[PDB]
Amino acid sequence: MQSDAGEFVDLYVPRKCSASNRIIGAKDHASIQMNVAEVDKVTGRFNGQFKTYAICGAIRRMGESDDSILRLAKSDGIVSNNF
Amino acid sequence: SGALDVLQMKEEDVLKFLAAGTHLGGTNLDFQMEQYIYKRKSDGIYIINLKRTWEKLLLAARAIVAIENPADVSVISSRNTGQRAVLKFAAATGATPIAGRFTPGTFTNQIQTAFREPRLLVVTDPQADHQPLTEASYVNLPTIALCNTDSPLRYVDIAIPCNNKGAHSVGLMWWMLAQEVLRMRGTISREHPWEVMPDLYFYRDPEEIEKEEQAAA
Amino acid sequence: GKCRGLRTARKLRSHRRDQKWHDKQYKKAHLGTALKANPFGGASHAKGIVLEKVGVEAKQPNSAIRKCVRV
Amino acid sequence: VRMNVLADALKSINNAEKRGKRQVLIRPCSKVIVRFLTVMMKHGYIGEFEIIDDHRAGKIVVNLTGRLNKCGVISPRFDVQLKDLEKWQNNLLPSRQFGFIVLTTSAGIMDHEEARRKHTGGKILGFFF
Amino acid sequence: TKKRRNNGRAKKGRGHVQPIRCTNCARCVPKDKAIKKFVIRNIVEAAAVRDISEVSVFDAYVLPKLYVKLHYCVSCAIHSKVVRNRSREARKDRTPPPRFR
Amino acid sequence: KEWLPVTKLGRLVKDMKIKSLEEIYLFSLPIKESEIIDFFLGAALKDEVLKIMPVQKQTRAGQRTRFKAFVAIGDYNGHVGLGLKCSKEVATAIRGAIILAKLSIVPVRRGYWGNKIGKPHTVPCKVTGRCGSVLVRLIPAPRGTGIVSAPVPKKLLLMAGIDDCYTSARGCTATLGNFAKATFDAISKTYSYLTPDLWKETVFTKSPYQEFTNHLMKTHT
Amino acid sequence: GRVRTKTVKKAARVIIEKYYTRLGNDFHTNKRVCEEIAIIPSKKLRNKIAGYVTHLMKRIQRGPVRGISIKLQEEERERRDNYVPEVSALDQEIIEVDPDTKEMLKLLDFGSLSNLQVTQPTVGMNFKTPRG
RNA sequence: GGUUCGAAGACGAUCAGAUACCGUCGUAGUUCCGACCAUAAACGAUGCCGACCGGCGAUGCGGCGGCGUUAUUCCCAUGACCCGCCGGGCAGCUUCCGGGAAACCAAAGUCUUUGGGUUCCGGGGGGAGUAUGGUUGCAAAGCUGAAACUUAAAGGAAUUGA
Ligand SMILES: [Mg+2]
Ligand SMILES: [Zn+2]
């Protein structure tokens, strides 16, 4: 987003929905920022690190927030691939 | 949820689900809840897949553990069935319970007495608790729901496919979320089975209360 | 337009030409009838002889006599 | 009847992209559609696609990335001379930074910026931004 | 402005339905436009039954009924209060009124 | 004049832990306090009343006139807000309209016409905004063109800090309730438009409630 | 014609909400505690509020009175008829487990339990309601 | 050919009047056969062909798979129910698909991010579907169809009143 010289000029960079790959508008109030906790392999206990996801307003009220969160988690290997 | 033998579904937990009757969905089926259903019976009731119940329940447990301050998780049930279970969950974890009649504008109205401002919503039945979901449209607020086969997944981000109708089923599903949150946190051990009996969560209707008030007397 | 074919030019041209008569101001300027009916005959001004004076009464709310002249 | 096949194919992609679908099956596969989609891929608006042979007109399954605002067609195929490619790319495309007019020339099917460089005018197919 | 979806009538995919004479007037209304009503009535009203239950020659002769199907035009139906005007919302309710007793 | 915060992020702002409107706009937080906008963009925010409009409702004993004031606010460096408000006095109609205009300000995105030298002066691409019948379109123009538009979009785009813009309006624009709402929706869409610059995959920062969680547990109930 | 107004009901509900610790089932005891805790300028309104307090709190004891919910305190008050069950209502023996559910468990590894009795299936698919 | 009904008619009422509504009769007509007529709120007030874009439960015709009930007792095999699937068709309910001035619409969507093909047709309200010519018809009348003049509004959906 930079000029001829190479100076990043726009006053901020908006987030993009993990499911749809739309940019989450400055006032898309039905957009979520959901942290799914990362668990230690040997104990099964919380580490203090998380696998964060963003989703757009249209996707949520479409009713595809459930399957999209699921598929992102199953891609990361949080949910078992077998499922 | 998976790739781990520690978070794996135990032979103890299966008998608890079958005894409560959480594997049994409704007669009618939603189009976005097909992936959580094994098969339809002769009698025409849908059998919910208990692995896919467990995978989503652990995903929900993870999402609740990642929230740091435990008192900006609002737990909700408007009907009779959940009112005990959410208060038990609330006291046991530190989550803030809204039991019976969610007044419209607790997240939207600044001037209200009960102007709450949570970071995660856990809901018993989207059809009954439709107002907290429709209101969590106005605030950037992820939603968890005890969704039945009949449930619409509009404004629901992780739907745990269960029976949310039966009084035993609601009680246990709240109990296993309450326990997995505490285990993952590192408060209870996976070595020992949990102190609390799941009947501490169940809804005793006045009829059962009066019959037992004569029984024990 | 509607008919978009690459050899659809006489259709478009002829159609617009037919439909421009249904325009009021076009047909007014392009028929002879208006410039026959115009007293001045398509002129800026016109000279005439005064033959009587007239008091033309106004319409509703405006009540007055507008002092015109027959020419 | 089905007069234009590229018109159907681009409306199918456009409808699927708006609805937020992750891949779309555009049916009556043709040399012009494939050569259109290769150009669209080389700039990186679509993903990798897989063309499915039944012993007929084939099918195409296009893996969609959510970075495609519009993919349209111009019918009829107007004969764009090189100097007039300015007034075309002026009134079709959003800005002078991004977006492409793909037009079928002597050399082959290629975007306005390539055709301007190669010094060739030709018949317009469509646009994608 | 469009008031009904089904233009006050239960014709969808015909073109023509033969008309009927109203039972109050003799006004020609189409067969499906008309407000139809089926009155199944005892011949003897309410108290007459008791007097004819005693002054009958026979033993538990279940005295007959009177079956009359009535077609009303919309004006005759509204005037006789067989139907009434309704709210914009309530207009769409097609479930007939409960007849519990 | 003591502003005690009612909202959770009204607390984090007054405690000087969030130090930009970009922290808010990035995480799409609803701004319910009128004082957060007066905190950050307090200096350069300038009001202009677009119109006062008397709207009536019929009763059996006379009409009941109440006044509706349209207010466009914004620093001339990439924020506009348009607020409307009805009241029995024109004074409290303006006062409420100003407050609502502050509540609902958006960041505008600015780009270049062709060559990418200096600071961004025009709209990054062709954007259209609709309200009722009115359709306002904003097109990028070369440098030092000025704003080729009607007075109403001109003054909104002036306050937005866009210098160069060709415009084209259709519908019943005589209604300047819908005109300016159409312009504001057109302006507001510039940051919710995916150009090939916003292609680089996003890296996720902590939301300010997760960031300053431990502070908000002790600071207030 | 004895319908109590908003001022009676609201203020009585607020006093039950806060001071549930002292209020009782006797009228004259809670009349005195109400006079002590609350500044009510007239004596008639004092008796009206105290009268409502010792009618709501005579029904809190019964069951799920709506307009108030002191959750910890009302639930600890529901923890006065203590039914702590000794055997879990779930922890049972032989379970009737649907020949369809047999496979559902068998597609998980645990298709082999002691207390999974498979009841014969309901022949005749007549689970629907007539459209008459 | 003329049973019923019934424009014009004839009277009887009603009313200030009633050439009307109400009543009693009643001619052309209402019916059939053979020749004309070519218009209707001839309506979904919504051209036809093709593609894509949500959900749900019924319904009519055809096909396919499936526990079981029932009729042919002798049941193979046919019908009647029962539970799903596929393709056309008349519709329905639902929704922030999306559109629209709104009412409302899975099309009236896929439209300033504007182009799949093609026929007909509208350009403020009146004058006016009027005059005039031409044409079809036995006639009634149909199709084509202006101008001078006049006027700042007529109008569409929705809101609050009365
Ligand atoms: Mg007809
Ligand atoms: Zn009638």
Please, could you describe this protein's structure?
- This is part of a larger assembly, with 7 protein chains of 7 kinds.
- Chain A has 83 residues and is an alpha+beta fold.
- Helix content of chain A is 22%, strand content 22%.
- In chain A, strand 1 and strand 2 form a beta hairpin.
- Chain A is extended and about 50 Å long.
- Chain B contains 6 helices and 7 strands, in the order αββαβαββαββαα.
- In chain B, the strands form 2 sheets. A 5-stranded parallel β-sheet of chain B has the order 4-3-5-6-7, covered by helices on one side.
- In chain B, helix 2 packs across helix 5.
- By secondary structure, chain F is of the alpha+beta class.
- Chain F contains 8 helices and 8 strands.
- Chain F has helices spanning 8-14, 22-26, 35-40, 90-103, 151-160, 181-188, 208-211, 213-219, and strands at 48-55, 66-73, 79-87, 105-107, 127-131, 134-139, 147-148, 165-170.
- In chain F, helix 5 links the parallel strand 7 and strand 8.
- Chain G has a domain at 6-61: Diphtheria Toxin Repressor, domain 2, CATH 1.10.60.
- Chain G has helices at 6-18, 27-37, 43-56, 71-78, 99-106; strands at residues 95-96, 116-117.
- Chain G starts with 5 loop residues before the first helix and ends in a 15-residue tail after the last strand.
- Chains in contact: A-B, A-D, A-F, B-F, B-G, C-D, D-F.
- Chains A and B meet through strand 1, strand 2, helix 1 and helix 2 of A and helix 2, strand 7 and helix 5 of B.
- Bound molecules: magnesium ion (MG) and zinc ion (ZN).
- Magnesium ion binds at residues 15-16 of chain E.
- Chain D binds one RNA strand of 162 nucleotides through helix 1.
- Chain G: This is Small ribosomal subunit protein eS17.
- Chain G: There is a cross-link at residue 102 (Glycyl lysine isopeptide (Lys-Gly) (interchain with G-Cter in SUMO1)).
- Chain G: Keywords: Cytoplasm, Isopeptide bond, Nucleus, Phosphoprotein, Ribonucleoprotein, Ribosomal protein, Ubl conjugation.
- Chain G: It comes from Oryctolagus cuniculus (Rabbit).
- Chain G: GO terms for molecular function: structural constituent of ribosome.
> What characterizes the major β-sheet of chain E?
2 strands, antiparallel
Euclidean distance between termini CA atoms of chain E:
39 Å
What would you call the structural class of chain E? alpha+beta
The secondary-structure element order of chain E is EEEHEH
How much is the radius of gyration of chain B in Å? 17 Å
Report the end-to-end length of chain B measured between terminal Cα atoms.
46 Å
Number of strands of chain E: 4
Q: How does the SSE layout of this entry go?
A:
The structure is cut from a larger assembly and holds seven protein chains of seven kinds.
Chain A: E1 32-39, E2 46-55, H1 57-62, H2 65-76
Antiparallel strand pairs in A: 1-2
Chain B: H1 11-20, E1 37-40, E2 46-48, H2 50-65, E3 73-77, H3 80-93, E4 96-99, E5 120-123, H4 130-135, E6 143-145, E7 158-159, H5 167-185, H6 206-215
Parallel strand pairs in B: 3-4, 3-5, 5-6, 6-7
Antiparallel strand pairs in B: 1-2
Chain C: H1 10-19, H2 24-30, H3 33-37, E1 52-57, E2 65-70
Antiparallel strand pairs in C: 1-2
Bound molecules: magnesium ion (MG) and zinc ion (ZN).
The site of zinc ion has 7 residues of chain E, from helix 2.
The structure holds one RNA strand of 162 nucleotides.
